[PDB]
Amino acid sequence: FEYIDPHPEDPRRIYRIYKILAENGLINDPTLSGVDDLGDLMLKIPVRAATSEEILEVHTKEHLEFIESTEKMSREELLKETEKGDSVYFNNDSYASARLPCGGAIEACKAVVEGRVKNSLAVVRPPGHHAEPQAAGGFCLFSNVAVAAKNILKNYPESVRRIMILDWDIHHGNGTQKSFYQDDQVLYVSLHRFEMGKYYPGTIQGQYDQTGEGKGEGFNCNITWPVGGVGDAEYMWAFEQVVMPMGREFKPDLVIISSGFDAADGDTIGQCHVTPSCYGHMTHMLKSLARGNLCVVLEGGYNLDAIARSALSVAKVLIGEPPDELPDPLSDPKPEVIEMIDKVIRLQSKYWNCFRRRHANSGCNFNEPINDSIISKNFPLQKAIRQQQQHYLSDEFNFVTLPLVSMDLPDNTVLCTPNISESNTIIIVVHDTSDIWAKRNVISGTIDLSSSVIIDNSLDFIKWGLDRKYGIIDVNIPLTLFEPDNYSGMITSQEVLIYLWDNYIKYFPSVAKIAFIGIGDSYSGIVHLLGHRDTRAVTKTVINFLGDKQLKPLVPLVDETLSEWYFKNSLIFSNNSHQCKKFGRVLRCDTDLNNIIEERFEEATDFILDSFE
Partner 1 sequence: KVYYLPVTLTQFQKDLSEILISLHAKSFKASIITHPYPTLSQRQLTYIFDSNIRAIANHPSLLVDHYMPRQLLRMEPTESSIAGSHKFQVLNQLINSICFRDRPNEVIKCAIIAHSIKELDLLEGLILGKKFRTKRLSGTSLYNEKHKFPNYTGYSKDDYDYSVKRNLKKRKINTDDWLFLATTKHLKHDQYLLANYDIDMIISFDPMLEVELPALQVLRNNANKDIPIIKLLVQNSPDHYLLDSEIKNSQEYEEIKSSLLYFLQARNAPVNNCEIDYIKLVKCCLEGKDCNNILPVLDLITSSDSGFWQPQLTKLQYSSTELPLWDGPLDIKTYQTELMHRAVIRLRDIQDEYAKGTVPLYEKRLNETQRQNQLDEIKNSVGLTFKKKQEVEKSINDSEKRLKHAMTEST
Partner 2 sequence: RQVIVPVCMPKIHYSPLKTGLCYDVRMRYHAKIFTSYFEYIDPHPEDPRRIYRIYKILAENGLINDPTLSGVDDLGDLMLKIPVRAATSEEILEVHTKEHLEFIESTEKMSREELLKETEKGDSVYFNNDSYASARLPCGGAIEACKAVVEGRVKNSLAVVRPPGHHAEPQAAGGFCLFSNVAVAAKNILKNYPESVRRIMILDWDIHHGNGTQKSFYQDDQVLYVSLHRFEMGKYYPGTIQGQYDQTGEGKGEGFNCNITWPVGGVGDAEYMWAFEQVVMPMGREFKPDLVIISSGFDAADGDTIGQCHVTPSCYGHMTHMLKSLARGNLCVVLEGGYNLDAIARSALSVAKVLIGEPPDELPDPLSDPKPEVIEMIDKVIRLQSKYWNCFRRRHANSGCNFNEPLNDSIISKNFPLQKAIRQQQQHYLSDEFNFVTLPLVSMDLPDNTVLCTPNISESNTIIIVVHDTSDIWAKRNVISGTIDLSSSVIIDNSLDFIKWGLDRKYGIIDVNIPLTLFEPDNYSGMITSQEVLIYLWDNYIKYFPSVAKIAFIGIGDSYSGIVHLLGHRDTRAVTKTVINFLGDKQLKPLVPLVDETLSEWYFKNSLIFSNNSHQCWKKPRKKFGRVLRCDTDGLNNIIEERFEEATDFILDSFE
Partner 3 sequence: SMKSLENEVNGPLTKFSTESQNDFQSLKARNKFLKNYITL
Residues numbered 222 to 251 that lie near partner 2 (CB under 8 A) are 237, 240, 244-245, 248-249, 251
| Cβ(415)–Cβ(458) below 8 Å | no
Residues numbered 569 to 598 that lie near partner 2 (CB under 8 A) are 594, 598
How far apart CA 423 and CA 416 sit, in angstroms, is 11
Residues numbered 295 to 314 that lie near partner 1 (CB under 8 A) are none
Residues numbered 291 to 330 that lie near partner 2 (CB under 8 A) are 291-292, 316, 319-326, 329-330
| Cβ(90)–Cβ(81) below 8 Å | yes
11 binds partner 1 (CB under 8 A): yes
56 binds partner 1 (CB under 8 A): no
Smallest gap, in angstroms, from Cβ of residue 291 to partner 2?
A: 6
Quick one: what does residue 264 bind among partner 3, Zn ion, partner 2, none, with the CB cut-off 5 to 8 Å set by partner type? none
How far apart CA 125 and CA 504 sit, in angstroms, is 63
CA 489 to chain centre: 18
Identity of the residue numbered 544? N
Smallest gap, in angstroms, from Cβ of residue 592 to partner 2?
A: 8
How far apart CA 545 and CA 78 sit, in angstroms, is 66
Residues numbered 387 to 416 that lie near partner 2 (CB under 8 A) are 387-388, 391
Q: Segment near partner 1 (CB under 8 A), from 27-35, 301-309, 311-319, 467-475?
A: 27-35
| Cβ(445)–Cβ(360) below 8 Å | yes
Residues numbered 137 to 166 that lie near partner 1 (CB under 8 A) are 154-159
96 binds partner 1 (CB under 8 A): no
**Neighbour tally for 387: CB within 10 Å:** 11
Q: Which is nearer to partner 1, 27 or 282 (CB)?
A: 27
Q: Write phi, then psi, for 534 (nearest 5 degrees).
A: -130, 95
Q: Write phi, then psi, for 187 (nearest 5 degrees).
A: -105, 135
Quick one: what does residue 1 bind among Zn ion, partner 1, partner 2, none, with the CB cut-off 5 to 8 Å set by partner type? partner 1
Quick one: what does residue 116 bind among partner 3, Zn ion, partner 1, none, with the CB cut-off 5 to 8 Å set by partner type? partner 3
Smallest gap, in angstroms, from Cβ of residue 538 to partner 2?
A: 31
How far apart CA 263 and CA 244 sit, in angstroms, is 21
Smallest gap, in angstroms, from Cβ of residue 46 to partner 1?
A: 11
Q: Which is nearer to partner 2, 269 or 326 (CB)?
A: 326
Torsion of CA 599, 601, 605, 606, to 10 degrees: -10
Smallest gap, in angstroms, from Cβ of residue 350 to partner 2?
A: 13
Smallest gap, in angstroms, from Cβ of residue 108 to partner 1?
A: 15
Candidate list 23, 65, 68, 114; residue touching partner 1; CB under 8 A: 114
**Neighbour tally for 320: CB within 10 Å:** 9
Nearest to 413 by CA among 427, 400, 396, 394: 400
Q: Which is nearer to partner 1, 10 or 502 (CB)?
A: 10
Quick one: what does residue 112 bind among partner 2, partner 3, partner 1, none, with the CB cut-off 5 to 8 Å set by partner type? partner 3
Burial 189-217 (b: 16+ CB within 10 A, else e): bbbbbbeeeebbeeeeebebeebbeeebe
- DSSP line for 394-421: HHHS-PEEPP-TTS---TTSEEE-TTTT
Identity of the residue numbered 68? E
Q: Write phi, then psi, for 192 (nearest 5 degrees).
A: -155, 165
Candidate list 52, 87, 182, 480; residue touching partner 2; CB under 8 A: 480
Candidate list 7, 23, 34, 454; residue touching partner 1; CB under 8 A: 34
Q: Per-residue x/- mask for partner 2, residues 539 to 558, rule CB under 8 A?
A: --------------------
List, in sequence order, every residue forming a beta bridge with 186; answer none if it has no partner: 163
Q: Which is nearer to partner 1, 156 or 607 (CB)?
A: 156
33 binds partner 1 (CB under 8 A): yes
Nearest to 255 by CA among 206, 188, 312, 348: 188
Q: Which is nearer to Zn ion, 192 or 431 (CB)?
A: 192
Q: Which is nearer to partner 2, 481 or 512 (CB)?
A: 481
Q: Which is nearer to partner 3, 289 or 514 (CB)?
A: 289
Q: Which is nearer to partner 2, 172 or 316 (CB)?
A: 316
> How many CA atoms are closer than 13 Å to the CA of 364, on its beta-carbon side?
15
Smallest gap, in angstroms, from Cβ of residue 337 to partner 3?
A: 34
Q: Segment near partner 1 (CB under 8 A), from 28-36, 275-283, 494-502, 581-589?
A: 28-36
Q: Which is nearer to partner 2, 371 or 424 (CB)?
A: 371
Packing angle of the helix pair 561-568, 523-531 (nearest 10 deg):
140
Q: What is the CA radius of gyration of the chain?
A: 31
Smallest gap, in angstroms, from Cβ of residue 123 to partner 1?
A: 15
Q: Per-residue x/- mask for partner 3, residues 107 to 136, rule CB under 8 A?
A: -----xxxxx--------------------
Smallest gap, in angstroms, from Cβ of residue 163 to partner 3?
A: 12
Within 8 A by CB and 6+ apart from 166, the residues are 189, 190, 191, 243, 255, 256, 257, 258, 286
Within 8 A by CB and 6+ apart from 185, the residues are 153, 161, 162, 163
Q: Which is nearer to partner 1, 6 or 25 (CB)?
A: 6
Q: Which of 59, 130, 171, 281 is catalytic?
A: 130
353 binds partner 2 (CB under 8 A): yes
Q: Segment near partner 2 (CB under 8 A), from 23-31, 88-96, 182-190, 410-418?
A: 23-31
Nearest to 190 by CA among 170, 167, 209: 167
Instruction: Examine residue 201 and say whether the peptide bond preceding it is cis (omega within 30 degrees of 0).
Output: yes
161 binds partner 3 (CB under 8 A): yes
Smallest gap, in angstroms, from Cβ of residue 32 to partner 1?
A: 7
How far apart CA 151 and CA 107 sit, in angstroms, is 11
Residues numbered 426 to 455 that lie near partner 2 (CB under 8 A) are 433-438, 440, 442-447, 449-455
Residue 431 a catalytic site member? no
Please state, in angstroms and as integers, the Cα–Cα distance from residue 512 to each residue in 243, 425, 469, 498, 507, following that order: 60, 6, 14, 18, 12
Burial of 255 from C-beta contacts in 10 A (0-12 / 13-18 / 19+): buried
Quick one: what does residue 217 bind among partner 1, partner 2, Zn ion, none, with the CB cut-off 5 to 8 Å set by partner type? none
Active site residue ranges: 130
- Which residues contact partner 1 (rule: CB under 8 A)? 1, 3-4, 6, 10-12, 31-35, 114, 154-159
- Which residues contact partner 3 (rule: CB under 8 A)? 112-116, 158-161, 253, 290-291, 293
